[PDB]
Amino acid sequence: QPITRENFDEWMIPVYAPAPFIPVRGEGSRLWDQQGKEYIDFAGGIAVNALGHAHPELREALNEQASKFWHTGNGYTNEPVLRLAKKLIDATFADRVFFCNSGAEANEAALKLARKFAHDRYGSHKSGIVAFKNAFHGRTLFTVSAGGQPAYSQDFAPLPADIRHAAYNDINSASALIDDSTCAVIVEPIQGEGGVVPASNAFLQGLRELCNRHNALLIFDEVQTGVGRTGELYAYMHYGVTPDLLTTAKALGGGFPVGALLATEECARVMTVGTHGTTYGGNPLASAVAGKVLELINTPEMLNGVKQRHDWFVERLNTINHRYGLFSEVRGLGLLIGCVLNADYAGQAKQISQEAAKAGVMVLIAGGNVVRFAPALNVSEEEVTTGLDRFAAACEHFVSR
Amino acid sequence: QPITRENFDEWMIPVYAPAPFIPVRGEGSRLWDQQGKEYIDFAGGIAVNALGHAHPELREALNEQASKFWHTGNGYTNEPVLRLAKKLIDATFADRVFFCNSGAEANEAALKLARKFAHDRYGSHKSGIVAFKNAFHGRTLFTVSAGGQPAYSQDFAPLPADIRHAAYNDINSASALIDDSTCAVIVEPIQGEGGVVPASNAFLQGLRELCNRHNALLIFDEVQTGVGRTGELYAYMHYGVTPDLLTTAKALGGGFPVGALLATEECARVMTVGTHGTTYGGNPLASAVAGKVLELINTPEMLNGVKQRHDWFVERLNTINHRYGLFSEVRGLGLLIGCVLNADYAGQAKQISQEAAKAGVMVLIAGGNVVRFAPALNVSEEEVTTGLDRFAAACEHFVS
Numbered sequence: 069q070p071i072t073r074e075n076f077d078e079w080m081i082p083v084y085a086p087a088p089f090i091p092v093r094g095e096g097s098r099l100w101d102q103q104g105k106e107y108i109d110f111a112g113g114i115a116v117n118a119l120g121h122a123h124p125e126l127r128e129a130l131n132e133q134a135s136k137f138w139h140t141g142n143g144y145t146n147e148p149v150l151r152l153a154k155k156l157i158d159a160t161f162a163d164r165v166f167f168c169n170s171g172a173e174a175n176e177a178a179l180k181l182a183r184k185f186a187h188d189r190y191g192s193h194k195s196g197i198v199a200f201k202n203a204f205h206g207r208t209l210f211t212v213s214a215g216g217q218p219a220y221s222q223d224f225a226p227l228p229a230d231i232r233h234a235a236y237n238d239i240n241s242a243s244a245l246i247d248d249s250t251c252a253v254i255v256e257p258i259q260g261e262g263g264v265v266p267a268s269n270a271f272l273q274g275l276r277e278l279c280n281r282h283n284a285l286l287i288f289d290e291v292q293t294g295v296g297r298t299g300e301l302y303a304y305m306h307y308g309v310t311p312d313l314l315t316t317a318k319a320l321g322g323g324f325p326v327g328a329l330l331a332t333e334e335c336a337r338v339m340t341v342g343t344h345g346t347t348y349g350g351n352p353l354a355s356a357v358a359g360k361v362l363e364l365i366n367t368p369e370m371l372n373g374v375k376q377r378h379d380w381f382v383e384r385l386n387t388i389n390h391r392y393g394l395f396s397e398v399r400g401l402g403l404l405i406g407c408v409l410n411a412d413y414a415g416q417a418k419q420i421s422q423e424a425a426k427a428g429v430m431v432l433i434a435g436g437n438v439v440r441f442a443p444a445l446n447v448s449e450e451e452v453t454t455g456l457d458r459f460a461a462a463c464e465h466f467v468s469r
Numbered sequence: 470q471p472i473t474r475e476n477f478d479e480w481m482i483p484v485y486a487p488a489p490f491i492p493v494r495g496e497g498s499r500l501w502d503q504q505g506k507e508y509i510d511f512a513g514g515i516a517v518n519a520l521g522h523a524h525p526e527l528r529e530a531l532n533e534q535a536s537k538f539w540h541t542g543n544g545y546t547n548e549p550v551l552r553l554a555k556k557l558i559d560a561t562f563a564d565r566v567f568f569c570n571s572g573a574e575a576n577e578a579a580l581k582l583a584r585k586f587a588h589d590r591y592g593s594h595k596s597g598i599v600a601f602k603n604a605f606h607g608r609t610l611f612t613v614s615a616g617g618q619p620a621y622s623q624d625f626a627p628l629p630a631d632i633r634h635a636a637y638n639d640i641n642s643a644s645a646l647i648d649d650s651t652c653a654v655i656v657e658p659i660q661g662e663g664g665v666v667p668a669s670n671a672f673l674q675g676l677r678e679l680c681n682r683h684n685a686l687l688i689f690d691e692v693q694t695g696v697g698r699t700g701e702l703y704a705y706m707h708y709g710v711t712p713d714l715l716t717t718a719k720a721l722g723g724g725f726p727v728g729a730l731l732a733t734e735e736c737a738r739v740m741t742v743g744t745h746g747t748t749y750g751g752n753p754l755a756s757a758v759a760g761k762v763l764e765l766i767n768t769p770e771m772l773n774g775v776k777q778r779h780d781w782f783v784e785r786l787n788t789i790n791h792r793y794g795l796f797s798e799v800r801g802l803g804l805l806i807g808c809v810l811n812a813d814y815a816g817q818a819k820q821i822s823q824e825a826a827k828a829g830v831m832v833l834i835a836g837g838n839v840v841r842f843a844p845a846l847n848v849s850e851e852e853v854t855t856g857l858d859r860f861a862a863a864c865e866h867f868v869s
């Protein structure tokens with residue numbers, strides 16, 4: 069059965085325009101297409117493949133649970149999901165956990181819980197959600213209404229009401245929207261899709277005190293920043309500000325579809341029998357893989373390793389920048405890194421990313437003006453250097469093209 | 470340390486009260502708990518495990534793709550997901566496919582599409598969704614609002630507006646709510662959670678005619694009825710009524726998390742670049758497993774074997790009933806079957822399910838009044854008979 073890139077244009081609902089080449093296998097941070105062409109993968113599954121492609125221990129954990137059973141639905145619990153839940157509890161501020169299949173699902177759960185909590189303790193009039201312009205929280209109607217790209221919601225109106233958007237990093241802007249009718253504030257600790265913008269420490273403490281004063285739940289959407297991405301297990305640990313609810317997905321599963329809502333006891337108590345659920349969520353196959361991911365990522369050597377790899381990327385992006393004058397700045401934390409184009413190259417991140425693919429390196433964008441790097445947290449130093457040589461070659465061609 | 474059932478009550482957010490025992494491995498339609506106790510599984514992963522537990526070809530397909538790569542995200546397509554798309558297109562009214570990770574994400578995609586379609590062609594104001602009381606379409610705010618059980622949506626208001634609910638199987642009920650302002654009519658061909666109640670043929674044909682007259686998209690939610698469950702690949706084929714959009718998940722991936730929206734070319738055209746998305750949807754791992762599920766399920770022999778199995782359950786359930794006087798009726802289609810409790814035992818489905826489980830057979834409920842069977846499509850004759858023996862012994866303990 070022959071499969072060609074032109075078949076994509078015929079068979080898929082056309083919401084993505086993907087690369088002209090089709091990957092068939094990978095290993096660590098290398099990936100190969102149907103013709104044998106090789107790419108260093110700095111796109112990292114969009115900050116999902118925290119341990120790279122075809123990781124041998126993730127494969128062994130997959131196969132070992134797959135040969136026992138995969139799924140029953142949540143009428144029956146299972147050992148891997150319980151052990152996963154306990155790892156998450158032991159490692160974070162959480163007392164309890166809910167599992168689902170994607171970051172949007174995790175965010176739906178955290179916003180539902182915040183609505184119910186407010187309604188049960190104060191009255192059903194306390195429904196307001198404050199989110200931030202340029203945030204990304206998912207594609208379901210509710211989560212795309214919470215995110216701050218109105219282009220991604222207007223077509224699907226009427227939207228769920230009582231949501232409004234403050235400017236990121238702007239505490240007065242947030243303060244104007246949060247009041248005693250607010251149930252939740254949802255914020256990414258780094259706006260990933262929004263250009264790799266880190267929140268400042270004052271901004272997050274400011275949301276924590278505003279949530280305290282007005283009794284609203286503070287929700288950190290760590291679906292991109294989570295699971296080692298920043299050099300700590302979760303970003304809130306880097307920042308020292310503790311949320312009431314934390315969502316996690318993407319790198320949680322190292323590539324297997326999984327996500328989770330982390331909650332304090334007080335918040336968890338609110339969600340009684342039958343008030344929420346999911347058919348696939350919490351199956352033992354997901355749970356056995358995520359379990360293994362946490363075991364391999366949440367170690368001092370791997371997390372310090374992410375701080376080390378940060379500097380490899382940044383020192384070398386600086387020398388590339390010295391040669392080609394492309395970027396006003398390089399920002400981010402750990403291995404979520406954005407290269408901000410300057411005025412002479414404004415809105416050209418995607419063209420750079422396409423040249424980079426031609427030169428055999430996968431990178432992402434973050435809005436049209438930022439080139440994004442989200443490589444595997446175990447990428448090797450050889451893979452970082454060879455991928456950046458290719459990125460530097462692609463920048464050279466670009467600077468004439 | 471060792472995991473206990475009690476840990477479940479300390480660590481999980483308490484949305485489910487799961488069984489007292491904890492499964493640890495299974496094969497076909499048998500499953501075993503941590504103490505070695507054996508169950509015949511007629512729950513079938515809530516109509517998900519169409520091939521049973523730990524299926525060796527599903528395993529082989531999983532491990533073979535897992536040794537190439539699992540995931541890139543949708544900036545790059547892959548061969549498994551394109552092959553799976555083609556299988557679905559060749560086998561259904563669909564021309565194009567979107568992939569996601571759950572039946573709710575599938576229904577989100579479908580309702581979004583019908584919104585944009587109507588908006589783009591008619592205007593901002595044509596936004597109405599008609600759904601049916603007792604429907605279940607998932608747990609995202611939008612899908613749980615489309616669902617017809619207000620008890621699962623109320624707490625999370627305000628709910629997305631322009632949604633209304635008609636009485637299932639009631640053509641004039643639906644006709645009253647569907648006008649030129651309706652963008653979509655979503656409906657399950659058999660209501661699963663709402664008691665294993667099949668649509669009638671005139672009801673579906675009637676929704677199709679009304680959708681056509683008022684230019685609204687007809688969405689079939691086949692996440693429970695689809696992929697072989699009724700004895701045809703999709704229940705629409707059984708009824709002979711073709712939707713514009715169809716959603717599928719659960720049995721799609723035989724236990725691996727996957728879902729999909731099937732669309733006609735005209736409908737697919739409205740979703741341009743960046744208008745919807747998913748990080749994990751269409752990954753090659755789910756795609757490889759779901760491809761192999763379709764290969765094994767969509768065969769004359771598996772599907773005719775589902776018709777046969779229907780008659781094994783119904784004939785023996787009628788025999789059990791004749792003996793114990795529990796139910797007023799055994800209904801459903803294929804291997805989605807509900808035993809409706811009589812007046813005397815009304816509201817007791819869960820107690821009969823708990824008794825079943827003590828006797829070594831897993832069954833589900835569908836509302837407090839129906840006992841629901843949704844076993845693997847390849848359940849063997851011997852599994853049906855041993856599980857139904859243990860169901861008989863459970864009905865006997867229960868009836869007293």
Ligand SMILES: *Cc1c(COP(=O)(O)O)cnc(C)c1O
Nearest residue numbers: 170171172205206291292747748
């Ligand atoms: C990608 C992402 C989501 C949504 O994830 P899916 O798994 O695509 O549903 C939510 N939040 C953030 C911060 C993300 O980067």
Ligand SMILES: *Cc1c(COP(=O)(O)O)cnc(C)c1O
Nearest residue numbers: 346347571572573606607692693
């Ligand atoms: C279970 C189910 C859904 C929701 O699927 P999830 O994978 O649980 O999100 C939607 N529709 C029907 C008919 C279902 O049975």
Ligand SMILES: [Mg+2]
Nearest residue numbers: 188340343624
């Ligand atoms: Mg309540």
Ligand SMILES: [Mg+2]
Nearest residue numbers: 223589741744
């Ligand atoms: Mg448009």
Ligand code: NA
Nearest residue numbers: 157160161162
């Ligand atoms: Na904790």
Ligand code: NA
Nearest residue numbers: 558561562563
């Ligand atoms: Na077709």
